[PDB]
């Protein structure tokens, strides 16, 4: 027939890695460091580098078992290899931060089970296998819980107690993938935050990179340069926070995401000219792109301030998440966020007042604090906006009644 | 091959509209009013009518931008048009209920982004775009939050703070659609009630109409005349409440749903002979169909009363929803519902008692109030049903212990 | 084309039944009893047997209506038949445990609606029909709620107030099924525990058996012998608890699951040589297989004890479920479970201490009770593990601070 064709399911990958066929490739490049693998026919070597030299010294390994998957954190180095006709699939952990004399452990998966993806969390490690199993391990080598995956894994990321799994929930058509996300919190109270929700992607695009921001919010990038971030303040939906194609000059130009930071806001990525991944040598330079939510009429003052407001809102939801889970957060960052947002609301209200859009001013005042609304009332008494001042006063009464 | 064939995904639509190819078509017909579009080669006009003349005067617009999507509420008129080679896709709002002198605003979507569906809520508006984005706007023109859709939108509806999105979650086979529902509450505490649950449809049918009842419960109709309603009292499942094919006399006869009302119960729709949608002229007459849940042996007294009981139960769940969300509800309606249900239970218990089904009587008494159970005990002492009276007494003891 | 092919959706089935084409087949074989159907051209008979003769006497029925689906519980016998050109699809219940003189009821489904699956709960019965409807009935014959199914049903099971539905959520490819699970609790507070989550299956396998353990935990088996159980302590994920292929000697050997028991742990199944289901005559013998979670390096002492620990953890989650839902549970079973787990942790800590893996000892002590940690501190003071004793002491301080 001549209709829709099933899209081939994309293969699993480690975020921040370059393809396996390269002689000198990146196994992982994140906010902790870089892991490179030089593999020809004579020898196979793995080199580990840390951005902060104080964390650990540079580590060089002789890749005898031919490790093809790697992840790096401030605690350990995680390595994995598939099975051969003689050896089993192995998970290798270099626990360099351990305070004891045993800084290494390795485990063999059962017969005919191959590791397809790994990720490192805070004090734990996870491995998705060809048996549609997810195996949890402590950073010291204890086997934790095991559960089955609803489909073949695509990529896996970890941060703190959070586990971020993207897998094939179905079969897409006409170039589209059919991906689902399983988001778990592996603390003392186990929670499945997302029960295989559909992962939004740009049409005819595939998954290019997943992970967490340094502050601990799940994020991912598709092959069309669209960067999306979990919106905890919007029912755990996914909000686009950047479009790396706006910084590209041609079709063959791409950006290779390395890390995401919310405070200060910066998207650390490698500019790539001619391909989607940078060559290992010479050392590529990390670029810093700004985040921009895809808002309408962003060239106008209204659209510009509206984008700044909602970007400030979503990039400070992590403070509430750190508070709800007992983590440590700076109360000063929370206060600066509110002041930054109340200033943008006040400037947007003054703009709507100049445009004789007084109903819009009351809508903006609904997002304001009680102090900001009281200030907007006196600004409305000024400039002879008498009815607007009355509507704002009635809004201030309603806000005080909500307490 | 000769097997299952992929079903073509149905295109987005506005509920209560007639096809675009008509010279004189309905853009939207709901419980607020009617919006018609007359478009030939000479001129293009849009006419707005309100069922209640006291709400607003009849509005006539010169459709210069060729708006093809429309929605209507007691607050504003929402219009949208796709992009051309010279103009961008635009969202136009006629805020006629505004108390200020600015009763109009329009916004341009970014390049190559087209509006595919719109809907109006209480004080807000939403637009699903070709970029798989959902854009939220206040009724006054402020851009609110934005998040990505898991698939191409099919239809969109709003009521109060609720957002009702139906989209393609996959690809169906053999005439079946693969639809998912995302139900959000956009109040001060954002909630995603349904994380893309599968939307039940009749086999080989497509989505024909979605929306909310006047009381605020999500409902939808498929192409086979099956009307389904969210059952908040049954874990947010979907319960069939009507079958418009029972009122049709032939295959070519159809009913075109306009609105759904829970108190009093009535399904307002347009009878259509020969097609699925009514012609614009002459003005079609609104028919009132009754709701009937698809219960077994409904011709018998037992099945008839069982259908009346569960229809009364599901059509009063909205009272609990209005109470939990601080909305205003009549306590008298809640009391009349319970009295209506306790009377049906009492008549079903008397029927089971006549049939010497005393175990069934105790099952019916489990659904009764403590006062109704006490009354059933004295009715069981009467007519010499001594063991039944003892079982009902032990049930009354258990009910008092649950407090 | 030459690519992925759509997998034909498997047909609905009753768990514990043998195919319909057999002259003498099992309609259901569970922990309550056996129901056999002998059907040739001369006569059609249904025989009911109870494992405990004290429950009820053996029942013999003349299958005049040609019932093809059956389920059995300690309360009633449930039978169902499809519709013919003269008769409707019927649901027949033999309420043998009733304390009244009416121990039978039957109901007719509407025109062109056929029963596809049934299941028995505590005091209720459910039937999934060809109209994509789920109909609830009390054990005495009262019609309860009705809601629509997101797809064609595959199998259905019930236990207490829990309803376990597996259905087709999509179309799989290359031999894979696309199954979803809807898990409901039908008590006085209706809950949808699983909103159509994807059902994990072994690749290229189909669903072979579903049901609940005697303690009330959902479980299911695929065609590759993998037995999975709901992990309530792991965010309602699914954990493999057995692999019946490890007990098979050849490809043609299979195990036919009958029941699952958590305390004592035993998987009751019928060994089958040459086919997937046992012949009705002679009476097959019920085998008892042990549960084994698929852990790595299970031949070693570490892997063996780690498997025993997590098997003990998951097979005692039902005690917490019985407690949260007011059911009756033995506090002695909960105490024996903790003692069994603290002993395994203590032996694993002593093993890690012998291997000079002191960081791993602290990880194991995190899973210990406060008394077990205090004991591990004195064991660390012994054998001159001074730093380990300090780390365990700081862990004991942190545990006391969590109260």
Short mmCIF file of C-alpha atoms in Angstrom, two decimals, chain B residues 230-384:
data_model
loop_
_atom_site.label_atom_id
_atom_site.label_comp_id
_atom_site.label_asym_id
_atom_site.label_seq_id
_atom_site.Cartn_x
_atom_site.Cartn_y
_atom_site.Cartn_z
CA UNK B 230 -16.83 11.35 33.01
CA UNK B 231 -17.80 9.38 36.12
CA UNK B 232 -16.09 11.25 38.97
CA UNK B 233 -17.63 8.81 41.45
CA UNK B 234 -16.05 5.82 39.67
CA UNK B 235 -12.35 6.67 39.58
CA UNK B 236 -12.70 9.09 36.63
CA UNK B 237 -13.85 6.40 34.21
CA UNK B 238 -16.16 7.13 31.27
CA UNK B 239 -19.79 5.99 31.42
CA UNK B 240 -22.21 5.89 28.46
CA UNK B 241 -25.23 8.07 29.22
CA UNK B 242 -27.10 7.99 25.89
CA UNK B 243 -27.30 6.34 22.47
CA UNK B 244 -28.76 8.71 19.88
CA UNK B 245 -29.12 5.82 17.40
CA UNK B 246 -32.05 4.53 19.46
CA UNK B 247 -33.94 7.67 18.39
CA UNK B 248 -32.94 7.34 14.72
CA UNK B 249 -35.11 5.50 12.21
CA UNK B 250 -32.52 4.77 9.51
CA UNK B 251 -28.81 4.56 8.78
CA UNK B 252 -28.78 8.02 7.17
CA UNK B 253 -30.41 9.68 10.20
CA UNK B 254 -28.15 11.30 12.80
CA UNK B 255 -28.24 13.64 15.78
CA UNK B 256 -25.99 16.71 16.00
CA UNK B 257 -25.20 17.42 19.65
CA UNK B 258 -25.37 21.05 20.81
CA UNK B 259 -25.26 20.87 24.60
CA UNK B 260 -25.58 18.60 27.62
CA UNK B 261 -27.46 19.49 30.81
CA UNK B 262 -27.49 17.47 34.03
CA UNK B 263 -30.16 19.32 36.06
CA UNK B 264 -32.64 19.11 34.51
CA UNK B 265 -31.40 16.14 32.47
CA UNK B 266 -31.59 16.88 28.75
CA UNK B 267 -29.41 16.28 25.68
CA UNK B 268 -29.93 19.23 23.34
CA UNK B 269 -29.22 18.19 19.75
CA UNK B 270 -30.38 18.81 16.18
CA UNK B 271 -32.08 15.91 14.34
CA UNK B 272 -30.49 15.46 10.92
CA UNK B 273 -32.10 13.44 8.11
CA UNK B 274 -29.69 12.37 5.37
CA UNK B 275 -26.45 13.74 6.83
CA UNK B 276 -24.52 14.10 10.09
CA UNK B 277 -24.81 17.90 10.31
CA UNK B 278 -27.80 20.21 9.82
CA UNK B 279 -27.95 22.83 7.07
CA UNK B 280 -27.57 26.43 8.18
CA UNK B 281 -30.83 27.57 6.55
CA UNK B 282 -33.56 27.33 7.50
CA UNK B 283 -32.82 27.55 11.23
CA UNK B 284 -32.89 23.98 12.60
CA UNK B 285 -35.00 23.18 15.64
CA UNK B 286 -33.25 22.00 18.80
CA UNK B 287 -34.55 18.63 19.98
CA UNK B 288 -34.40 17.41 23.58
CA UNK B 289 -33.43 13.76 24.02
CA UNK B 290 -33.49 11.89 27.32
CA UNK B 291 -30.47 10.14 28.81
CA UNK B 292 -30.51 6.35 29.12
CA UNK B 293 -27.64 4.29 30.48
CA UNK B 294 -27.14 0.98 28.58
CA UNK B 295 -28.47 -1.36 31.25
CA UNK B 296 -29.69 -4.91 30.75
CA UNK B 297 -33.35 -5.97 30.69
CA UNK B 298 -34.48 -2.35 30.88
CA UNK B 299 -38.01 -3.39 29.91
CA UNK B 300 -38.41 -5.14 33.27
CA UNK B 301 -39.25 -3.28 36.47
CA UNK B 302 -35.91 -4.27 38.02
CA UNK B 303 -33.82 -3.11 35.07
CA UNK B 304 -35.86 0.07 34.67
CA UNK B 305 -35.38 1.10 38.30
CA UNK B 306 -31.70 0.11 38.26
CA UNK B 307 -31.12 2.37 35.26
CA UNK B 308 -32.97 5.24 36.95
CA UNK B 309 -30.91 4.81 40.13
CA UNK B 310 -27.47 4.87 38.50
CA UNK B 311 -28.48 7.66 36.12
CA UNK B 312 -29.47 9.69 39.18
CA UNK B 313 -26.15 8.83 40.85
CA UNK B 314 -23.89 9.88 37.98
CA UNK B 315 -25.87 13.05 37.15
CA UNK B 316 -25.40 14.38 40.70
CA UNK B 317 -21.65 13.78 41.07
CA UNK B 318 -21.22 17.36 39.83
CA UNK B 319 -22.63 18.63 43.14
CA UNK B 320 -19.72 17.05 45.01
CA UNK B 321 -17.30 18.51 42.46
CA UNK B 322 -18.74 22.00 42.93
CA UNK B 323 -18.43 21.54 46.70
CA UNK B 324 -14.84 20.26 46.68
CA UNK B 325 -13.74 23.21 44.51
CA UNK B 326 -15.56 25.88 46.51
CA UNK B 327 -18.10 26.53 43.77
CA UNK B 328 -21.71 27.46 44.52
CA UNK B 329 -24.23 24.61 44.61
CA UNK B 330 -27.80 24.22 45.85
CA UNK B 331 -28.06 22.02 48.94
CA UNK B 332 -31.70 21.38 47.98
CA UNK B 333 -30.60 19.65 44.77
CA UNK B 334 -28.37 17.34 46.81
CA UNK B 335 -31.24 16.46 49.16
CA UNK B 336 -33.69 15.80 46.32
CA UNK B 337 -31.13 13.51 44.68
CA UNK B 338 -30.77 11.39 47.82
CA UNK B 339 -34.54 11.21 48.33
CA UNK B 340 -34.98 10.17 44.69
CA UNK B 341 -32.35 7.44 45.09
CA UNK B 342 -33.61 6.15 48.45
CA UNK B 343 -37.10 5.84 46.95
CA UNK B 344 -35.79 3.77 44.02
CA UNK B 345 -33.79 1.56 46.39
CA UNK B 346 -36.89 1.09 48.55
CA UNK B 347 -38.98 0.09 45.52
CA UNK B 348 -36.25 -2.28 44.31
CA UNK B 349 -36.05 -3.83 47.78
CA UNK B 350 -39.82 -4.35 47.84
CA UNK B 351 -39.59 -5.96 44.39
CA UNK B 352 -36.81 -8.32 45.46
CA UNK B 353 -38.84 -9.16 48.57
CA UNK B 354 -41.83 -10.13 46.41
CA UNK B 355 -39.54 -12.37 44.34
CA UNK B 356 -38.34 -14.14 47.52
CA UNK B 357 -34.81 -12.79 46.88
CA UNK B 358 -33.97 -11.78 50.44
CA UNK B 359 -30.19 -11.79 49.93
CA UNK B 360 -30.69 -9.25 47.13
CA UNK B 361 -32.69 -7.08 49.55
CA UNK B 362 -29.70 -6.84 51.91
CA UNK B 363 -27.47 -5.89 48.97
CA UNK B 364 -29.87 -3.07 48.08
CA UNK B 365 -29.99 -1.98 51.73
CA UNK B 366 -26.20 -1.54 51.69
CA UNK B 367 -26.77 1.41 49.33
CA UNK B 368 -29.41 2.90 51.66
CA UNK B 369 -29.09 5.55 54.34
CA UNK B 370 -29.32 4.57 58.00
CA UNK B 371 -32.91 5.85 58.13
CA UNK B 372 -33.88 3.84 55.04
CA UNK B 373 -32.31 0.68 56.46
CA UNK B 374 -34.21 1.12 59.73
CA UNK B 375 -37.40 1.47 57.69
CA UNK B 376 -36.56 -1.67 55.71
CA UNK B 377 -36.19 -3.60 58.98
CA UNK B 378 -39.77 -2.80 59.99
CA UNK B 379 -40.95 -3.68 56.48
CA UNK B 380 -39.13 -7.01 56.89
CA UNK B 381 -40.73 -7.63 60.29
CA UNK B 382 -43.98 -7.07 58.42
CA UNK B 383 -44.81 -9.87 55.95
CA UNK B 384 -43.02 -12.37 58.26
#
